[PDB]
């Protein structure tokens, strides 16, 4: 029952705005640390993902598995979101509780244009 959530993971901008203007913590989190960020970026959200970034929304939180919003962008592949995070400060070299980075994530799920992408911006 998190209206952060929610409409950060289904893109729904408006419902987002309104219900971090209604109070809504953008820093909110599940029972596995997740925030509206790592579902933004981990489902190709861009706009939402601004949205969360704007409002204070940390780039580089880090949930049970510490992974950040960075690894679930470049695991799944959503470029967009991937570059965004980066123009925000997103730390490329965090690694995960299973000691990969977000590039190394990025790698084991064949996300080769997304490693490129990493590698470029360094």
């Known amino acids: 029952e998190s209206i952060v959530h929610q409409t950060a993971s289904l893109g729904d901008v408006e419902g987002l705005k309104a219900a971090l203007a209604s109070g809504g913590n953008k ?3 599940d029972s596995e640390g997740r925030t509206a960020l790592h579902f933004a970026c981990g489902y190709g959200e861009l706009k939402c993902a601004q949205v969360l970034i704007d409002a204070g929304a940390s780039v580089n939180a880090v949930d049970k598995n510490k992974n ?12 967009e979101c991937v570059s965004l995070l980066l123009e925000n400060g997103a730390a490329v070299t965090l690694q995960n509780l299973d000691e990969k980075t977000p590039i190394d994530v990025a790698k084991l799920n064949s996300q080769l244009e997304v490693v490129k992408l990493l590698e470029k911006d360094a």
């Open 68 to 79: 950040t919003p960075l690894h679930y962008a470049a695991g799944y592949g959503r470029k």
């Open 27 to 29: 820093d909110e989190e």
